[PDB]
Design an enzyme around this catalytic site. Structure first.
Site, short mmCIF file in Angstrom:
data_model
loop_
_atom_site.label_atom_id
_atom_site.label_comp_id
_atom_site.label_asym_id
_atom_site.label_seq_id
_atom_site.Cartn_x
_atom_site.Cartn_y
_atom_site.Cartn_z
N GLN A 99 32.69 -55.63 -12.77
CA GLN A 99 33.05 -56.20 -11.45
C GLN A 99 32.71 -55.20 -10.31
OE1 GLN A 99 37.03 -56.48 -9.60
NE2 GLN A 99 36.79 -58.70 -9.84
N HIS A 166 32.99 -59.36 -6.56
CA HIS A 166 34.41 -59.47 -6.25
C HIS A 166 34.51 -60.10 -4.85
CE1 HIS A 166 38.55 -59.10 -5.75
NE2 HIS A 166 38.74 -57.88 -6.25
N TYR A 171 39.55 -58.51 -0.18
CA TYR A 171 38.62 -57.36 -0.13
C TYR A 171 37.33 -57.71 0.72
CZ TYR A 171 42.14 -55.32 -3.03
OH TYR A 171 43.35 -54.91 -3.49
N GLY A 316 45.20 -60.92 -16.95
CA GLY A 316 45.29 -59.56 -16.48
C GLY A 316 46.45 -58.88 -17.17
N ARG A 317 47.65 -59.20 -16.76
CA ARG A 317 48.81 -58.42 -17.29
C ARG A 317 48.95 -58.51 -18.83
NH1 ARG A 317 53.09 -61.34 -13.54
NH2 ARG A 317 51.33 -62.87 -13.62
C1 LIG Z 1 47.32 -53.83 -12.50
C2 LIG Z 1 46.47 -54.88 -11.79
C3 LIG Z 1 45.21 -54.51 -11.31
C4 LIG Z 1 44.32 -55.47 -10.88
N1 LIG Z 1 43.04 -55.11 -10.44
C5 LIG Z 1 42.16 -56.13 -10.11
C6 LIG Z 1 40.85 -55.81 -9.85
O1 LIG Z 1 40.41 -54.69 -10.05
N2 LIG Z 1 39.99 -56.83 -9.57
C7 LIG Z 1 40.39 -58.13 -9.40
O2 LIG Z 1 39.55 -58.98 -9.12
N3 LIG Z 1 41.70 -58.48 -9.72
C8 LIG Z 1 42.54 -57.48 -10.11
N4 LIG Z 1 43.80 -57.82 -10.52
C9 LIG Z 1 44.14 -59.26 -10.67
C10 LIG Z 1 43.87 -59.74 -12.12
O3 LIG Z 1 42.51 -59.88 -12.38
C11 LIG Z 1 44.49 -61.13 -12.33
O4 LIG Z 1 43.97 -62.08 -11.40
C12 LIG Z 1 46.01 -61.02 -12.15
O5 LIG Z 1 46.51 -60.08 -13.06
C13 LIG Z 1 46.79 -62.33 -12.37
O6 LIG Z 1 46.64 -62.75 -13.68
P1 LIG Z 1 47.80 -62.52 -14.82
O7 LIG Z 1 48.88 -63.52 -14.54
O8 LIG Z 1 47.09 -62.88 -16.10
O9 LIG Z 1 48.25 -61.06 -14.71
C14 LIG Z 1 44.69 -56.83 -10.91
C15 LIG Z 1 45.97 -57.21 -11.34
C16 LIG Z 1 46.88 -56.23 -11.79
C17 LIG Z 1 48.08 -56.73 -12.63
#
Ligand SMILES: Cc1cc2nc3c(=O)[nH]c(=O)nc-3n(C[C@H](O)[C@H](O)[C@H](O)COP(=O)(O)O)c2cc1C
Length: 369
Positions: A99, A166, A171, A316-317
């Site tokens: 990304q 992204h 951003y 993500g999480r």
């Molecule tokens: C610790 C953390 C860091 C993240 N960093 C990014 C990132 O680098 N790029 C991005 O597009 N989204 C980032 N996200 C968003 C995740 O890609 C994702 O959309 C978000 O965790 C929600 O999904 P979940 O419910 O599965 O956690 C981040 C989220 C968290 C939890």
């Protein structure tokens, strides 16, 4: 289950439709080079062959970098570190997109070499003043577009299967798409088509660099994170941008829910139906934000019954807490409860490398390598 079906995304024959979402974790050094154990982190999560992983957001140029301890892909030392990460993923028969981003007005001003380097589409701070960003000039926009293309070439040269642009979460690209930030009076702002131009031209330059089958695009149309999601014509603005992404024939669109400002206001459209409709049925769509094993299964099954059969879900999480997530979901094993301590950790192996596999997965691992 639809979620468990193989799916071709770009050039990659994925074996199931559970994706590692991009997640910043600040395990890069002060030079933007991933720490030497970042390869074991992605390797852990390359648990099951045919998984797609998308990396944490990666910087495109030293001037555009907004945080310390996040990685870049402009330098030779960065590019060699990423080649090694990507090698580890491929050794486990998995796929990985890098990304690519720029933080624009959300950069940490203390980290920038000069205060001039805090840039955006317009001079509009995220919070009521709020240090003021500087509006990019025409030539600086052209340069940023070429920097995205050159980062994409570097990624593909390090072996990445693809890059994700992204375009989300407030951003720099999203700072051009949305009128709550972009108040420009030149051809990069001031109408739905003009605001979309930055994202459309970054996409086109990256496609020229690497081909449409190695490019995905992430947006977060409804998200209210970082000053986004408030313009009156929010829906038309993203219907337009997603129609253009579909016309450019990108390998996938990735749409994500983020932090909703007021929990008493219901979200309009949790699974992005209004935007999936414009994107269409034929090309893969990744949905992210708030899914678990049961709701990833349900939404993919029900979308398939509604003719949208090409849907993957990114986590993500739970991919932070659960390195063998796709193994667990396919075997009916509970995902690991995640914790805020690990989300808010930086730099260390602790809170990063030390989430265990399921005991079940360990049971199958009982052999000499
Ligand atoms: C610790 C953390 C860091 C993240 N960093 C990014 C990132 O680098 N790029 C991005 O597009 N989204 C980032 N996200 C968003 C995740 O890609 C994702 O959309 C978000 O965790 C929600 O999904 P979940 O419910 O599965 O956690 C981040 C989220 C968290 C939890």
């Amino acid at each position: 289950a639809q979620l468990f079906k193989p799916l071709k995304v770009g050039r990659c024959h994925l074996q199931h439709r559970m994706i590692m979402a991009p997640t910043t974790r600040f395990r890069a050094d002060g030079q933007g080079v991933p720490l030497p154990f970042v390869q074991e982190y992605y390797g852990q999560r390359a648990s099951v062959p045919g998984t797609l992983l998308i990396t944490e957001a990666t910087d495109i140029t030293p001037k555009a970098m907004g945080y310390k301890h996040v990685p870049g892909i402009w330098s030779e030392p960065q590019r060699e570190a990423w080649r090694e990460i990507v090698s580890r993923v491929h050794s486990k028969k998995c796929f990985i997109f890098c990304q690519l981003w720029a933080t624009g007005r959300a950069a940490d001003p203390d980290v920038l070499a000069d205060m001039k380097d805090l840039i955006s589409s317009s001079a509009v701070p995220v919070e009521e003043k709020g240090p003021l960003p500087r509006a990019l000039t025409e030539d600086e926009i052209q340069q940023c577009i070429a920097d995205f293309a050159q980062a994409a070439r570097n990624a593909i040269n390090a072996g990445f299967d693809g890059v994700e642009i992204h375009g989300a979460n407030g951003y720099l690209i999203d700072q051009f798409t949305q009128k709550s930030c972009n108040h420009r009076q030149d051809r990069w702002g001031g109408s739905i088509e003009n605001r979309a131009r930055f994202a459309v031209e970054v996409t086109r330059a990256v496609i020229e660099a690497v081909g449409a089958d190695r490019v995905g695009v992430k947006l977060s149309p409804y998200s209210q994170y970082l000053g986004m999601g408030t313009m009156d014509e929010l829906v038309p603005q993203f219907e337009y941008l997603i129609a253009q992404m579909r016309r450019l024939d990108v390998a996938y669109l990735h749409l994500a829910n983020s932090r909703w400002l007021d929990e008493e206001k219901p979200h309009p459209d949790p699974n992005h139906e209004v935007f999936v409709r414009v994107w269409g049925q034929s090309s893969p769509i990744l949905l992210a934000g708030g899914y678990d094993a049961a709701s990833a299964e349900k939404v993919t099954e029900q979308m398939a019954a509604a003719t949208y059969t090409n849907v993957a879900i990114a986590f993500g999480r739970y991919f932070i807490s659960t390195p063998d997530l796709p193994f667990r979901v396919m075997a009916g094993i509970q995902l690991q409860k995640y914790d805020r301590a690990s989300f808010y950790s930086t730099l260390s192996r602790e809170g990063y490398l030390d989430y265990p596999f399921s005991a079940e997965y360990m049971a199958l691992h009982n052999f000499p390598v």
